Amino acid sequence: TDTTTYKNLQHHDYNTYTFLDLNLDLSKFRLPQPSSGRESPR
Amino acid sequence: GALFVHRDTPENNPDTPFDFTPENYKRIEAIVKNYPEGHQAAAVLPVLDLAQRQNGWLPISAMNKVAEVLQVPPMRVYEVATFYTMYNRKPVGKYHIQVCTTTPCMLRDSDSILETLQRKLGIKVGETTPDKLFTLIEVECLGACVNAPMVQINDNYYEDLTPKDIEEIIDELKAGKVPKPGPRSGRFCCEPAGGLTSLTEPPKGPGFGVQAGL
Amino acid sequence: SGVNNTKKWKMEFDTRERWENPLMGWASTADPLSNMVLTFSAKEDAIAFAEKNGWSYDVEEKKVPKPKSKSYGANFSWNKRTRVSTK
Amino acid sequence: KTSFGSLKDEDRIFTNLYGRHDWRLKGALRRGDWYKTKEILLKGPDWILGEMKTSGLRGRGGAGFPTGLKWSFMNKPSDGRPKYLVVNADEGEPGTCKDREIMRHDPHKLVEGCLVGGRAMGARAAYIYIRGEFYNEASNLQVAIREAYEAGLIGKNACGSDYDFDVFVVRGAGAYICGEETALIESIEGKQGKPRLKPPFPADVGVFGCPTTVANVETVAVSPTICRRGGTWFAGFGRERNSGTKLFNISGHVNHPCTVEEEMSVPLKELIEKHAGGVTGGWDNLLAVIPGGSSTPLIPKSVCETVLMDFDALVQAQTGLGTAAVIVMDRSTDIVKAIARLIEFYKHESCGQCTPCREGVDWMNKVMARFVKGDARPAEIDSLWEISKQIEGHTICALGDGAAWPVQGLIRHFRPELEDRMQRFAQQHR
Amino acid sequence: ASNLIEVFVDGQSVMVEPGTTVLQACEKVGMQIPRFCYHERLSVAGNCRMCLVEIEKAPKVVAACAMPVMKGWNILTNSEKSKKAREGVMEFLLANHPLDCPICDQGGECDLQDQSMMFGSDRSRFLEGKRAVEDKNIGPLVKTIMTRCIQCTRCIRFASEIAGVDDLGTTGRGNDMQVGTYIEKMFMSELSGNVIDICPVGALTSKPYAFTARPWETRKTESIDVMDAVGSNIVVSTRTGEVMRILPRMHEDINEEWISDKTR
Ligand SMILES: Cc1cc2nc3c(=O)[nH]c(=O)nc-3n(C[C@H](O)[C@H](O)[C@H](O)COP(=O)(O)O)c2cc1C
Ligand code: SF4
Ligand code: SF4
Ligand code: SF4
Ligand code: FES
Ligand code: FES
Ligand SMILES: [K+]
């Protein structure tokens, strides 16, 4: 119930790969993607 | 300032060595899996940004490598890399200082911040220090306007800046230590200075004010 | 892209010899009906004029451009190949 | 009610606006997020859309369009294509930091709102397009999303409601035009940030050609609190048709520039004198206010005396409520220089696709620079007004309108200042 | 009237199929709405904004090249809002367009000049300096003077959709948006002189035809191409008894609007 202290200090120790490492960690939790029926629109 | 054409140079020709690290290829695979099948062209921006984060700047070989990986046209990759302003098509320093110079930062005197930065680094805007440690440019609004004036150094925001504060940040960067982000004026975030006008009470907690029938 | 010159029928003549003037290099001609172009409101009117003046004619039917189905949303198709890659 | 303002802390939605509590899942659950969200999802799409409609929430993006109708545009049977919620988290507009603050301080509100809106419209995923410069905010958002996935609030059983929903975060790469709806859709699809024409509307053909809905972070984040506490409460706040609370970012020449949450229809003088600490030098030292970010025109002190903070009130004041970004300028402000800096911003941020915004905004930037120098004659004021009228309403997207409106406000109010600058330049050269 | 909707152009009724755009309805009635980026065989771009027209009882002008008619719309093609919109868009194009008309191969063949004379104003209010763009070197067939380019993306859409090469595009942003290739690339496929055809300005001109003649000089002879067995209908432009140019002819069943590079 503390209120006089800033509590976003976790953003200080972020490196340049933090976002993509989190995304790679998140990749296992996701549903399979839909398919458009072709490999590419060419 | 910049030119949206490519001239082959010995440092930026399409034979300069760029390739992703294997862990970066794993990250690229996750990025591609974030999108529906047949729409892997949606991963152009994150893969190009990953190339920039690995390499520093973005050479034409890096753009061609991103195009070759994603099987998209290299002209489409060039269109993205030239449209978006966060892509470095030329090498920058170790620290890329971006000083916001839009209207509320100008009201809170970003010009003094810019002039003291030019005096401290010995360079003009848009150019690099000769030791390749600092590039200094002006930018538009960075989305922190109540904390004006502010700069962005790489991925960090340094806010509520005075000339003494920005000189201290430059001293820490030259010394090689992190200057820590956030405001330098003694307030933690966007809160009002000299006390809080709101949110003084503790939050009410779960199940407060819930409508009946839910 | 303007189409205002495709509204009226024209009758022209077969092209004859244009040679080089020895003195000056100009385009000398010998037929008088080289610049003769006649404008008609209708194909049958041009037919009547040609038959009246006793000239053999070749008639080309009017090439009206075909109607085309245009959809701006086809540029952003989910599955079809009409999805564009740039704008 | 007749007078509006003085919003209570127990009625404020963003209870962790200042980052004084834990922004992670434990702190969010202590503050009351993710409460009965399974019951909300089992109540289902039509009930949530009815709750938004009876709340009368309007778009916090700056468009001002009703949220209930806009989200009910996707309340259709599926034609085999997937459906998507897309969250505008770019926050490009000057003067505005509210989306940044709530993304880095209440991210679980944004995640729960993504789930609620995606269930209401029928959606398998929400793509949060965040601003490219907000790297730490995006990483905090990904931490919150990983916490939600681990707790089972997101993904293949949405809080145990037999609903599958995924939340992706996609970063931009520095374009203010990518905060636009269709340009954001194109940027997610991987092309340049160029807006596409309407029709087709994004509820029919949007991201990946699928039906989609682009909604602001503030709108999405206040959606689950609206569902929990009812639309009658949120409609009871604010005036008629301008209902609820609002995040105001007061910046410029004020003593305490800050982001605050206040009720709709609060007087502008009351908001500044209560939360910003007043104008630097005082209310008499106040000169002009841009009330809705850079896209809205300016209003002078005389109409700033009694104006309210409603969409309708600012429309009557010949302005708009944009992102509720109140930029304050005092008597020492070079007002022509400030407006010219805004036009230079729009010149640097135009996507360049369509001719009126491209050529005309560059033209207006050059004319405004000469106006700052005084290097013009007063006929060019009416010429610039006509150029702004040619830009406005003739463009693909509303960046042309948002560049024409500040020029129109400056010409409408501070025209003798421009004429005085031209006269002083003329007499000092000739 | 099954699967047809009745719309009005200047109060005149016309039955059109659903999905017909405003421009197509107006050309069915018989009037040609001004355009720069719309081409009947390219995809809809909608960026030049020359086709802005007024719909009755509607406050905002719509882009006729992209907006489909709904039902009972009265399209006011010659109303004051439409005329003002055309004048404004023409002013915006000619503000940065370079004063190159005597030295430009699009002399009497200029859509920009003709639509300026028919729909724009007669004078300029632009008192500033113009932009200038360095030229590109996409090949010895197409000569690029990209200062004249109005960023209409016709060449980009053609090379993407018909030539199928995906080599052209726009690099940059805002007033600095430039059409071309980012790298020094030679754009050489077959069917590559049709960008010289469909570029409305003289930004993409023909290098063999450079500075040779003018369209009012050139006599037009409608003939057939024999360089292959397709039999593409062409126009031979001859001046003073000398073949000056080969252009295509519109034949929907053979070659549509284009000819091969060898033919051209
Ligand atoms: C040039 C331009 C830039 C915009 N930038 C943003 C932005 O950064 N963030 C945002 O939420 N909306 C932005 N908008 C407004 C969007 O249209 C709006 O957010 C979107 O329609 C979501 O609708 P909503 O207001 O109902 O939530 C921008 C609009 C324009 C024309
Ligand atoms: S108004 Fe400007 S930013 Fe919007 S589509 Fe047109 S060129 Fe792009
Ligand atoms: S393209 Fe047309 S308007 Fe431009 S210089 Fe050539 S003839 Fe003149
Ligand atoms: S070069 Fe010509 S066809 Fe291509 S965008 Fe420019 S004006 Fe259009
Ligand atoms: S205007 Fe400088 S951060 Fe927004
Ligand atoms: S012809 Fe419609 S905008 Fe160009
Ligand atoms: K041409």
DSSP codes joined into one string, A6-41: ---GGGTS--TTHHHHHHHHHGGGSPPPPB-SSS--
C79 neighbourhood in chain B, CB within 8 Å: 38
Both D307 and D323 in a single domain?
Answer: yes
B83 neighbourhood in chain E, CB within 8 Å: 170-173
Residue nearest to atom 4 of ligand 2 (CA): D397
Q: Which ligand is nearest to the CA of E106?
A: 3
**DSSP state at residue D195:** P
Which residues lie below 8 Å from residue B121, measured CB to CB, with a gap of 6+?
B129, B134, B136, B170
In the structure, how many helices (H) and strands (E) does chain D have?
Answer: 18, 11
Tokens found for residue D142: 């990904």
**DSSP state at residue E127:** -
- What are chain D's partners, defined as 3 or more CB pairs within 8 angstroms? A, B, C, E
User: Does the annotation flag D59 for ligand binding?
Assistant: yes
d(CA E187, CA B68): 20
Helical H segments across D152-199, by residue range: 181-189
Q: How far does chain C reach from its first CA to its final CA, in angstroms?
A: 21
Nearest Cα to Cα of residue D15 among D158, D168, D215, D229: D229
Q: Could you identify the atom of ligand 4 that is nearest to the CA of residue E144? A: 1
Both B85 and B125 in a single domain?
Answer: no
Nearest Cα to Cα of residue E50 among E129, E111, E100: E111
In the structure, how many helices (H) and strands (E) does chain C have?
Answer: 1, 4
Q: Which residues line ligand 3 (CB under 6 A)?
A: E 97, 100-101, 104, 106-107, 110, 112-113, 148, 201-202
Structure resolution, Å: 2.9
Burial of D347 (0-12, 13-18, 19+ CB in 10 A): buried
CA of A9 to nearest chain D CA: how many angstroms apart? 10
Q: What are the DSSP calls for chain B, one per residue?
A: ---SS----TTSSTTS-----HHHHHHHHHHHHTS-BT-GGGGHHHHHHHHHHHHSS--HHHHHHHHHHHT--HHHHHHHHHH-TTS-SS---SEEEEEE-SHHHHHTTHHHHHHHHHHHHT--TT-B-TTS-EEEEEES--S--TT-S-EEETTEEEES--HHHHHHHHHHHHHTS----EESSS-SSSSPSSS-SS--SPP--TTSSPPTT-
Note whether D399 and D348 are within 8 A (CB). no
CB of residue E179 inside a 6 A radius of ligand 4: yes
User: Chain-centre distance of CA B84, in angstroms?
Assistant: 12
Q: In this structure, what CATH number is given to the domain that contains residue D363?
A: 1.20.1440.230
CB of residue D358 inside a 6 A radius of ligand 2: yes
Amino acid at D357: C
Note whether D359 and D394 are within 8 A (CB). no
CB contact under 8 A, C3 and E32: yes
Cross-strand partners of D330: D286
d(CA E86, CA E84): 5
Max Cα–Cα distance, chain E, nearest Å = 56
Domain ranges, residue D51: 2-56
E169 neighbourhood in chain B, CB within 8 Å: 75-76, 78-79
Cis peptide before D297 (omega within 30 of 0): no
CA atoms within 13 A on the CB side of E233: 13
Residue D201 region by backbone torsions, left for phi larger than 0, else alpha for psi between -120 and 50, else beta: beta
CB contact under 8 A, D173 and B102: no
Note whether D39 and D273 are within 8 A (CB). no
Number of domains in chain B: 2
Residue at token pair 């099948």: B37
Chain B: residue whose CA lies nearest to A39 = B38
Nearest Cα to Cα of residue B55 among B22, B92, B84, B86: B92
Phi/psi at D319 (5° precision): -140, -165
Q: In this structure, what CATH number is given to the domain that contains residue D256?
A: 3.10.20.600
What spacing in Å lies between the alpha carbon of E198 and ligand 7's midpoint? 6
What spacing in Å lies between the alpha carbon of E100 and ligand 2's midpoint? 27
Nearest Cα to Cα of residue E227 among E185, E259, E192, E187: E259
Torsion, Cα E13 E18 E21 E23, to 10 degrees, reads -30
Nearest Cα to Cα of residue E45 among E203, E144, E165, E158: E158
Nearest Cα to Cα of residue D119 among D56, D213, D200: D213
Extended beta strands in chain E, E state = 5-9, 12-16, 52-55, 62-63, 74-76, 142-144, 169-171, 178-180, 204-206, 219-224, 233-238, 243-248
Buried b (16+ CB within 10 A) or exposed e, A12-37: eebeeebbbbbbbebbebbeebbebe
Max Cα–Cα distance, chain D, nearest Å = 79
Domain ranges, residue C13: 1-87
B37 touches chain A (CB under 8 A): yes
How many CB atoms neighbour CB B205 within 10 A? 12
Note whether D42 and D119 are within 8 A (CB). no
Note whether E244 and E237 are within 8 A (CB). yes
Note whether D153 and D37 are within 8 A (CB). yes
Nearest Cα to Cα of residue D129 among D62, D58, D209, D213: D213
Note whether C71 and E24 are within 8 A (CB). no
CB of residue D351 inside a 6 A radius of ligand 2: yes
d(CA B100, CA D355): 28
Number of domains in chain C: 1
Tokens found for residue B176: 């090689």
Number of domains in chain D: 4
Q: Which ligand is nearest to the CA of E110?
A: 3
Nearest Cα to Cα of residue D117 among D94, D86, D140: D86
Helix (H, G, I), strand (E, B) or coil at E187: coil
Nearest Cα to Cα of residue E183 among B14, B15, D352: B14
Note whether D112 and D30 are within 8 A (CB). no
Amino acid at D232: T
Q: In this structure, what CATH number is given to the domain that contains residue D116?
A: 3.40.50.11540
Note whether D383 and D389 are within 8 A (CB). no
Q: How many CB pairs under 8 A join B and D?
A: 232
Amino acid at E56: E
Please report which helix (H) or strand (E) contains residue C28, including its range: strand C27-29
What spacing in Å lies between the alpha carbon of E38 and ligand 6's midpoint? 5
Chain C: residue whose CA lies nearest to B40 = C85
Nearest-CB residue to E45 (from C3, C66, C87): C87
CB of residue E150 inside a 6 A radius of ligand 4: yes
Q: Which residue among D305, D333, D361 closes a domain?
A: D333
Angle between the B163-175 and B110-121 helix axes, to the nearest 10 degrees?
40
CB contact under 8 A, C85 and B41: yes
Tokens found for residue E230: 């397709």
**Strand E178-180 and strand E233-238: pairing?**
unpaired
d(CA E75, CA E57): 10
Torsion, Cα B118 B124 B128 B134, to 10 degrees, reads 20
A40 neighbourhood in chain B, CB within 8 Å: 38, 40-41, 71
Cis peptide before D200 (omega within 30 of 0): yes
Residue at token pair 């202290």: A5
Both B107 and B178 in a single domain?
Answer: yes
CA of B15 to nearest chain E CA: how many angstroms apart? 14
Nearest-CB residue to C2 (from E39, E111, E166): E111
Burial of E117 (0-12, 13-18, 19+ CB in 10 A): exposed
**DSSP state at residue E125:** -
How many CB atoms neighbour CB B198 within 10 A? 20
CA C14-C17-C21 angle, to 5 degrees, is 145
Both D299 and D161 in a single domain?
Answer: no
CB contact under 8 A, A42 and C83: no
Nearest Cα to Cα of residue D140 among A18, B182, B54, B50: A18
User: Does the annotation flag E39 for ligand binding?
Assistant: no
Note whether B48 and B63 are within 8 A (CB). yes
Tokens found for residue C32: 């008088």
Q: Which ligand is nearest to the CA of E22?
A: 6
Phi/psi at E142 (5° precision): -100, 120
CB contact under 8 A, A23 and B41: no
d(CA D21, CA D14): 12
Nearest Cα to Cα of residue C85 among E165, E183, E193, D350: E165
Q: Mutation test of the interface with chain B: which of D39, D99, D237, D259, choosing the one with the most B Cβ atoms within 10 A?
A: D259
What spacing in Å lies between the alpha carbon of D353 and ligand 1's midpoint? 18
Chain E: residue whose CA lies nearest to D365 = E128
Considering the domain boundaries, does residue B206 fall inside one? no
Which residues lie below 8 Å from residue D159, measured CB to CB, with a gap of 6+?
D34, D37, D38, D41, D115, D152, D153
CB contact under 8 A, B144 and D260: no
Cross-strand partners of E52: E63
- What are chain E's partners, defined as 3 or more CB pairs within 8 angstroms? B, C, D
Domain ranges, residue B36: 18-91
What spacing in Å lies between the alpha carbon of D181 and ligand 1's midpoint? 6
Note whether D304 and D318 are within 8 A (CB). no
Which residues lie below 8 Å from residue E175, measured CB to CB, with a gap of 6+?
D347, D350, D352, D358, D359, D361, D362, E96, E131
Helix (H, G, I), strand (E, B) or coil at D84: strand
Which residues lie below 8 Å from residue C15, measured CB to CB, with a gap of 6+?
C34, E221
User: Chain-centre distance of CA D251, in angstroms?
Assistant: 15
Nearest Cα to Cα of residue D51 among D269, D228, D275: D228
Burial of B49 (0-12, 13-18, 19+ CB in 10 A): buried
Burial of E137 (0-12, 13-18, 19+ CB in 10 A): middle
CA of B8 to nearest chain D CA: how many angstroms apart? 24
Nearest Cα to Cα of residue D403 among D208, D70, D251, D180: D180
d(CA D270, CA C44): 82
Both D212 and D246 in a single domain?
Answer: no
Helical H segments across D217-319, by residue range: 217-229, 231-236, 268-271, 301-304, 311-316
Residue nearest to atom 8 of ligand 2 (CA): D351
What spacing in Å lies between the alpha carbon of E28 and ligand 1's midpoint? 38
Burial of C39 (0-12, 13-18, 19+ CB in 10 A): exposed
Both B184 and B97 in a single domain?
Answer: yes
Residue at token pair 């709340």: D55
CA atoms within 13 A on the CB side of E87: 16
Burial of D89 (0-12, 13-18, 19+ CB in 10 A): buried
d(CA D165, CA E145): 52
d(CA E152, CA D177): 19
CA B86-B91-B97 angle, to 5 degrees, is 55
CB contact under 8 A, D146 and A26: yes
Note whether E32 and E16 are within 8 A (CB). no
Q: Which ligand is nearest to the CA of B103?
A: 5
How many CB atoms neighbour CB D112 within 10 A? 28
d(CA E206, CA E202): 9
C70 neighbourhood in chain D, CB within 8 Å: none
**DSSP state at residue D349:** H
**Strand D166-171 and strand D212-216: pairing?**
unpaired
B50 neighbourhood in chain A, CB within 8 Å: 20
d(CA E38, CA E52): 12
d(CA B173, CA D191): 36
Both D250 and D341 in a single domain?
Answer: no
Nearest-CB residue to D393 (from E60, E93, E172): E60
Amino acid at E36: F
D143 touches chain A (CB under 8 A): yes
Between the alpha carbon of residue B71 and those of residues B41, B76, B78, B192, D185, the distances in Å are 8, 11, 14, 50, 21
